[PDB]
Amino acid sequence: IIQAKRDAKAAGSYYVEAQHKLVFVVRIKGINKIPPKPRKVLQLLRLTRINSGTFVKVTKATLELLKLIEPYVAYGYPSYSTIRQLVYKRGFGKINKQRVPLSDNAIIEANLGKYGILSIDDLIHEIITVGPHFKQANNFLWPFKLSNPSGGWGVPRKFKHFIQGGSFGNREEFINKLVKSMN
Amino acid sequence: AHFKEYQVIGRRLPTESVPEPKLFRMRIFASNEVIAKSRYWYFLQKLHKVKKASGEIVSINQINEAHPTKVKNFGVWVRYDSRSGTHNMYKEIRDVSRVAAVETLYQDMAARHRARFRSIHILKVAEIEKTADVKRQYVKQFLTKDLKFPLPHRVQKSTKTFSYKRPSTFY
Amino acid sequence: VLKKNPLKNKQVLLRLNPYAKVFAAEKLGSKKAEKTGTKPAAVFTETLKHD
Amino acid sequence: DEASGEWVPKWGYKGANKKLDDQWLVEVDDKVKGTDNELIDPRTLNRAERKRLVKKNEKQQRRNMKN
Amino acid sequence: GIDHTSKQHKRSGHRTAPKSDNVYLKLLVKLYTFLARRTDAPFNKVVLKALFLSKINRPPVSVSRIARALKQEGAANKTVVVVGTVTDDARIFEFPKTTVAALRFTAGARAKIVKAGGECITLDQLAVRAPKGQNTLILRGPRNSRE
């Protein structure tokens, strides 16, 4: 990607990168006073409490859900380091409807080996590159229970858009800083 | 925040029988690239009939000040919103960078005109090459040959609650 | 009986990831890139500098 | 007429007593269910009822003339 | 707080234990609980579930009904299992020879089976004979026939 941008500039062109295929979404507001349709969309995205996060595959069917729940979440494009740290520290699997910590490759192999996933790094790979079994791997992952940001939210009022000096909405690449603070 | 200047070049999405659409470039003052892209789509929708869902961002690049350690006079032509319409304003700002001048302008608009970032439009920031074209007195008074001025009544900050001497304001 | 963070506990890190040993040995977190001398186009420079 | 902003005759030529005949949509009443009049047009039923009322008035007038 | 998608502390139920204080019925429940845990036999699961039912849900099964069940093809040598009372029927005059396992037999039903030439056994003897319910036929009495 770095070389493509350098070569396109050298040839008088502009290299347009591929759009992001993955977002990380964190619920930012509590459960009091939520409109029913955003409430339903939050339940469908498994954001049942404040500071719960999930990975979402970017399609037209999910971008509209994100647009619906924009005032109540902060989301963006996660990086490999963010995903690796999230899975290593707060990675829990859903086995027999139970929240089981991913402390050994045996659990991951036993529950996801039919899809070719043998280790926590295979799981991270399927998350970062949205593979054929992203739905199964992401639903195997229990929703991440994050803390409050360690250095604060950076704003005096959270419930404005990130463009307008608030917190909610698509902050794109800055979700990495926010989530590493909250992790 | 502390502003940066970007160039944002975008276009309509390519279609069959209309390939290679025109590229449009804007110079945007913003704190970050997310704000810069949002402002670009706002202005592109306001001027052309291009929507974010119908187009794409070809490129966004930060533009640095060419000579950040040279003092310059800037003429800033801005346009702000009112219920009667949009009104022009021309201000002159002496500073060492375009982003510094734009930040000074935004602070001055917030102080005086009670204006906000979403309502203020920057139409032009242009350096004045020759001092003879400067026509604001608060800028012209600093262009005097051999400019010297004192700073009477210096107030020194104290680190302690009680002082054992009466303070002096000499400088 | 107690969850241990691989990002802090080296033994748990090596248990989960056998390749962390190679990563640390080869210093792959500070890998140097090959130096290339590609130059941008004059049209790109003019577009960037244009008002 | 409240729904429009016009004054209309309440009977006769273009009268307001026959607007249900030309109404574009009529809800079928629940009370008509379980009867053989379920499949009949409510506009036609109202025309029949109006004609029956007219004939009842004519019969009452002829009764007054007989008496 | 959390926006719950389902109710909290919901009892599944599923009739864990019988309401009876019969010690022998409790012993049979214990035996078939062990069997349904350690045998992986659907017959043992069904019998354990049936042992938990109430009287109105355990209707009696007649010897005529048992004979009609044995009238099937390939079932003439099977063991009839009724988790409940086997009652007598005088409307049937020809009864086959068979082994019947039941909780209770009436005097008439027991006499009729023994006279035909078979045996009336208990559920624990059935568990000894067929630990996985081999060659068994579970009969249930009519529910809606009572009113």
Add this chain to the structure above:
Amino acid sequence: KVYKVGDIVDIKANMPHKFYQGKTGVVYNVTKSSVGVIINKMVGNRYLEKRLNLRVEHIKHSKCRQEFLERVKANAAKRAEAKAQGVAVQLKRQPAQPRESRIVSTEGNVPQTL
């Protein structure tokens, strides 16, 4: 243009009951001059069935299952084709995907500042 019982129709006027505009229902009764339509209206928390009587010209046939029928025909054809010539065929619809990388050349398309 004849409406049979069970057809799915759209209510499209060419003044009262303006709520039943653009609604789609199932025909339950047809006469010489009028057509009956069943509308499920959300009353409280449960759909309730309401009977409507319309003039013929104020409704039209609904094309709300045309794509489904054509897709079923195409799916059967594609599965038969892949049975004839063995290859994996993807028979499910997919959402719009994010677009891939591309190179935009400024050959004659030099960006114009506005």
Add this chain to the structure above:
RNA sequence: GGAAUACUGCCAGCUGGGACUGAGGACUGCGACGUAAGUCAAGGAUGCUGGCAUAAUGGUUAUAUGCCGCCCGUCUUGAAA
């Protein structure tokens, strides 16, 4: 023309100070370091040392100090009103 630095991001880089916690109770597992025997920070605290051995810690009780605390029941949306 040759550099540096800023900014942003990454490191399965190193290292110092502080706070709270020590659930569990033979072994079993997954690992790591060692040619090996073995060792280990790897499925939850051990080791060493001192003072006291009693009103000292602690409890009770009477009060003082900081902050919080409207009078219950009933009847009406609501009740200091």
Add this chain to the structure above:
RNA sequence: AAGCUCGUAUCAGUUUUAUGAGUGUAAGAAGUCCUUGUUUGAACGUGGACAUUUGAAUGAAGAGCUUUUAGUGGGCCAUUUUUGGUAAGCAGAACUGGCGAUGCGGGAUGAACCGAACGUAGAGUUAAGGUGCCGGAAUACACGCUCAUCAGACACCACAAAAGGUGUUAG
């Protein structure tokens, strides 16, 4: 609350796609093909078969059906549409929230405001609101404006005529 069955069953206050109106409907066993049988076309079928690449996304451990029964039902407020208005208030419909049954943080104080819903505790981080003193927290940093013979620290409605002024600042 009791029984029967099913549990890749049943689905959903959601999106997508297709089709409408300016939010409704549809998205598979309550399918499909061949063979030409019922009164050359619509509509009803005799006989065979295609499965776990069985027909968009996301979520979902409980679902469907028969019975069985305690307490209760004309309330207030607010938002969003629509019709008609008044000196001004507003009056009538439809949907959706909040409250009664509910404590906690903040707004000095409080039915409908901001935050957040509650097992007993420890440590950490925060929300809303704040950091002169009462009072935990910068008499922080920075650019401007203002001097009021009872300024202002507010609800953004009214007083309000975008009126008056030889106040001041920027256009």
Add this chain to the structure above:
RNA sequence: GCCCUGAAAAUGGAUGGCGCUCAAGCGUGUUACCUAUACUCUACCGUCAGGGUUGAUGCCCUGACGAGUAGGCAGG
């Protein structure tokens, strides 16, 4: 834009008080800091669920939950 006038009664009182004038006022920006029964981790209680087990309505392992009037069910 800010400031003054732009109508006011009637016990003595209120930006909550003190007070504050390059503010401790007004607009804006950048940080640091304070602390909720909220969030994160841990222990403990109870409930529910899923497993294992030849004082067995016991024991063991694991996971998630905990507001409440009328009222219901359960154990004391």
